[PDB]
Write a protein that binds this ligand. Structure first.
Ligand SMILES: *[C@@H]1O[C@H](CO)[C@@H](O[C@@H]2O[C@H](CO)[C@@H](O[C@@H]3O[C@H](CO)[C@@H](O)[C@H](O)[C@@H]3O)[C@H](O)[C@H]2NC(C)=O)[C@H](O)[C@H]1NC(C)=O
Ligand SMILES: CC(=O)N[C@@H]1[C@@H](O)[C@H](O)[C@@H](CO)O[C@H]1O
Ligand SMILES: CC(=O)N[C@@H]1[C@@H](O)[C@H](O)[C@@H](CO)O[C@H]1O
Ligand SMILES: *[C@@H]1O[C@H](CO)[C@@H](O)[C@H](O)[C@H]1NC(C)=O
Ligand SMILES: *[C@@H]1O[C@H](CO)[C@@H](O)[C@H](O)[C@H]1NC(C)=O
Ligand SMILES: *[C@@H]1O[C@H](CO)[C@@H](O)[C@H](O)[C@H]1NC(C)=O
Lengths: 729, 49, 49
């Protein structure tokens, strides 16, 4: 009636002495089973033995934990044993232990700084999860590039899983980027740098603009240039540019000046609004062997005469290809019981595909060709008919393919982008599989999302019964996040595809969700595949600030009302934005900490184990051959079942087949940026009342610009917290 | 003799190579190494290449 | 399965086949050349197998 299938879902990744979900599959009932995953040592003392009461048709996942290891990493062999009363089976795989750490980072006002000041910085620690973590440290120190520690503290402990600091500064350091150092008890190194320079602020504010990406056909170059040396005085005078076609063709012995052109669309500087300029690309002869351009502006000053020149935007953009299209949501892998959606769009300079440009959908080897055209957004969506072999490789054009060069030099050259794709199949010995469409688009949080996926069942069901089972599963941070299950209705012969599913979006998942579902069968074949989904940045504890409103200067008395979970600790870096405008937070965001996270996923193969040996081989089963002919031994490159276990990112131990090409050994063979005041306005720490604290802000008058906070909050009552943006005028 | 370009080439398993039975010691090879022909409903005759 | 020449008898041997059509046998199957460096690549050491 039912042949048993067992499968124990075992992320070989071990986050230590922490809850990490693991689980099992069993169905099609049989006598008795109480299996045990034992990571026995050479002796059997380092056994990570977890024997557990088991049954059929159930999902009930224990997140047991493990004490510390001897090494930081150590491969140990894992023979889960099939504790049946009359059947016992093993298979040894290395386990990817790791004495992994709790995670940390650093906060500073800036990286560049001013000489002679005191830097102010803070330090943080949390865990795998995004909750705080109070804990000591070995040490900390700032280091200078000369191999030496300019600042240091020793083995403090955190009040709330963080600490704030400062450090003075000499006015005579080495002008260079300096850095800070901490080591965990393991030796866990984090790094957050900081430079200093009292470079002279250039008086002038000469600013140029120009189009970047050019093509084989243009008409206009709408170039805006304006110099307000103080940001608020565009001088009444003249301006002249030097813009020039340039670039000897990779030749330097020419002994001359390689300017192909030099035009000066000079003009009278107007204080109204700004000077602007609008130059044409025709006189520049925007031709193929009309060579690269360079841009350099003569910004002359009135009643001073100390004229400035600036080479900005100068390095032109040799657009070797013209009419550049791409893919959009092209299914990286496809299937055979469905005509399926790839997608492609187009961009060109400004990023404007011609409306209703019709295309040449060269999706072949099924020779399903059927033209289409661009939607509003360049895009296009399309199924393609399916009775062919595993390999399929597709492409689409508006132009047509030419492989027609006359002579192998072709210094003469031209190109148009083509979105060609190669694809491979899925298994289906089990005679049922799904195609889970991707959600590779917008993803708001604090919701759920019914997924769209379409099962088949080849040959209907050979027997099946009234009801089989299907389960949908997601890994997270080395542990499964949730347990998804379902069943379908009764039918003995059909090809249906209207399956139901959903999952709630909050948090608690890698930046992706390798969601996986599979086709549990009574006949020892199970077919699935992962399904990777975006995880857009959203936090446990949201929060927002608000200030005593932005008004005239002198009013020192202000506020900064901030309102979050009832209890927390909080950074309060109320600062000037223009210094952050100067150098954006290329190294700070909520998304940052999501990705400053290391080891979000790690397929278990990684470095330590090159592979896993298993029992069968390809030469085996030397019994009668095909009746029609002789079928030798060979295989397919298509995406596979055993690998869907590693596409999940884990291993397992099973009787349902993964029988495919292992091997036989020896068969028969035997730039410069503007700056204003670096003055860091506010920097402090507070704790929220239950109702949302508000701190009287102190105006820094007599300095008007864009203003902003670098604040941040934290607690275990709701995890960390950030209102990632609220500026001030 | 066969006048057949091909039969069911495309198959899940390995594509059979020969239209008719060809081997070093096949069945009709016994009739050939005899040197005699025959006319039969069982599987004997072939063209060579 | 090694054997030996009888004074009155030659080798009378069987091998148990459990595989596909492609087969081939030999004896004195230890080396074809006693010495591969033989000399100046000018005269090949050949003994019957
Ligand atoms: C390519 O696309 C076409 C649809 O335009 C798919 O054709 C579909 O094929 C299935 C299976 O043959 C059809 O179901 C049954 O077909 C038989 C044909 O004799 C019919 O007698 C049954 O009543 C039943 O309809 C299905 O009807 C058909 N699509 C439509 C129009 O309903 C085809 O499967 C696609 N390529 C492949 C083979 O993946
Ligand atoms: C001729 C020229 O300078 N090109 C464009 C012009 O087509 C457009 O009307 C204008 C609007 O600001 O921007 C510029
Ligand atoms: C194993 C095999 O297929 N080869 C033959 C087998 O058919 C035969 O029955 C046996 C008798 O000892 O000799 C061997
Ligand atoms: C279940 O599977 C085992 C192994 O094939 C077998 O020994 C047993 O007879 C099967 N049936 C039951 C009901 O135990
Ligand atoms: C196993 O070895 C460890 C090493 O510390 C020891 O503590 C323990 O007592 C030994 N035996 C067990 C499993 O208790
Ligand atoms: C030759 O085969 C016999 C019969 O089994 C065996 O006893 C003997 O060890 C073999 N001789 C050699 C070369 O060892």
């Amino acid at each position: 009636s039912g042949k048993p299938q067992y499968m124990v879902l075992v992320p070989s990744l071990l986050h230590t002495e922490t809850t990490e979900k693991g689980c099992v599959l069993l169905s099609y009932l049989n006598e008795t089973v109480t299996v045990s995953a034992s990571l026995e040592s050479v002796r059997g003392n380092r056994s990570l033995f977890t024997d557990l009461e088991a049954e059929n048709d159930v999902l009930h996942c224990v997140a047991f934990a493990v004490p510390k290891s001897s090494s930081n990493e150590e491969v140990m062999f894992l023979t889960v044993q099939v504790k049946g009363p009359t059947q016992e089976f093993k298979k040894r795989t290395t386990v990817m232990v790791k004495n992994e750490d709790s995670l940390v980072f650093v906060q500073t006002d800036k990286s560049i700084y001013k000489p002679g000041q005191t830097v102010k910085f803070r330090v943080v620690s949390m865990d795998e999860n995004f909750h705080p973590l109070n804990e000591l440290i070995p040490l900390v120190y700032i280091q200078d590039p000369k191999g030496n520690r300019i600042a240091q503290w020793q083995s403090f402990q955190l009040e709330g899983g963080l600490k704030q600091f400062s450090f003075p500064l000499s006015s005579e350091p080495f002008q260079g980027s300096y850095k800070v150092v901490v080591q965990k008890k393991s030796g866990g190194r984090t790094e957050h740098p900081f430079t200093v320079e009292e470079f002279v602020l250039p008086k002038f504010e000469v600013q140029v603009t120009v189009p970047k990406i050019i093509t084989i056909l243009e008409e206009e170059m709408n170039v805006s240039v304006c110099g307000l040396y103080t940001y608020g005085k565009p001088v009444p005078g003249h301006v002249t540019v030097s813009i020039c076609r340039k670039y000897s063709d990779a030749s330097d012995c020419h002994g001359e000046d390689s300017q192909a052109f030099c035009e000066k669309f000079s003009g009278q500087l107007n204080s109204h609004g700004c000077f602007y300029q609008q130059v044409k690309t025709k006189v520049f002869q925007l031709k193929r062997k009309e060579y690269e351009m360079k841009l350099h502006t003569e910004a002359q000053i009135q009643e001073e005469g100390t004229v400035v020149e600036l080479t900005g935007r100068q390095s032109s953009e040799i657009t070797r290809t013209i009419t550049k299209l791409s893919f959009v949501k092209v299914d990286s892998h496809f299937r055979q019981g469905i005509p399926f959606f790839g997608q492609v769009r187009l961009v060109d300079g400004k990023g404007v595909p011609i409306p209703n440009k019709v295309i040449f959908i060269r999706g072949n080897e099924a020779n399903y060709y059927s033209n289409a055209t661009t939607d509003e957004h360049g895009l296009v969506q399309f199924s393609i008919n399916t009775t062919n072999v595993m390999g399929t490789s597709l492409t689409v054009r508006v132009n047509y393919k030419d492989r027609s060069p006359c002579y192998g030099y072709q210094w003469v050259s031209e190109e148009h982008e083509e979105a060609h794709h190669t694809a491979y199949l899925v298994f289906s010995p089990s005679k049922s599989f799904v195609h889970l469409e991707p959600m590779s688009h917008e993803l708001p949080c604090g919701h759920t999302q019914t997924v769209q996926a379409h099962y088949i069942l080849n040959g209907g069901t050979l027997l099946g019964l009234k009801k089989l089972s299907f389960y949908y599963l997601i890994m997270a941070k080395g542990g499964i996040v949730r347990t998804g299950t379902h069943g379908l209705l009764v039918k003995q012969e059909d090809m249906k595809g209207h399956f139901s599913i959903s999952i709630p979006v909050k948090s608690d998942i890698a930046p992706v969700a390798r969601l996986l579902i599979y086709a549990v069968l009574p006949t020892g074949d199970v077919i699935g595949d992962s399904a990777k989904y975006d995880v857009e940045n959203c936090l446990a504890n949201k929060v927002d600030l608000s200030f005593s409103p932005s008004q005239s200067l002198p009013a020192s008395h202000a506020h900064l009302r901030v309102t979050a979970a009832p209890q927390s600790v909080c950074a309060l870096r109320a600062v000037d934005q223009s210094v952050l405008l100067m150098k954006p937070d290329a190294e700070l965001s909520a998304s940052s900490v999501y990705n400053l996270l290391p080891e979000k996923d790690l397929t278990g193969f990684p470095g330590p184990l090159n592979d896993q040996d298993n029992e069968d081989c390809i030469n085996r089963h030397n019994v009668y051959i095909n009746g029609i002919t002789y079928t030798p031994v060979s295989s397919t490159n298509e995406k596979d079942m055993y690998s869907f276990l590693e596409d999940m990112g884990l291993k397992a131990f099973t009787n349902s087949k993964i029988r495919k090409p292992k091997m036989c050994p020896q068969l028969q063979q035997y730039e410069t940026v503007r700056k204003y005041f670096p003055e860091t306005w506010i920097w402090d720490l507070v704790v929220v009342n239950s109702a949302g604290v508000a701190e009287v802000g102190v105006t820094v008058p007599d300095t008007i610009t864009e203003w902003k906070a670098g604040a941040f909050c934290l607690s275990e009552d709701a995890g960390l917290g950030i209102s990632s943006t609220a500026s001030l005028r």
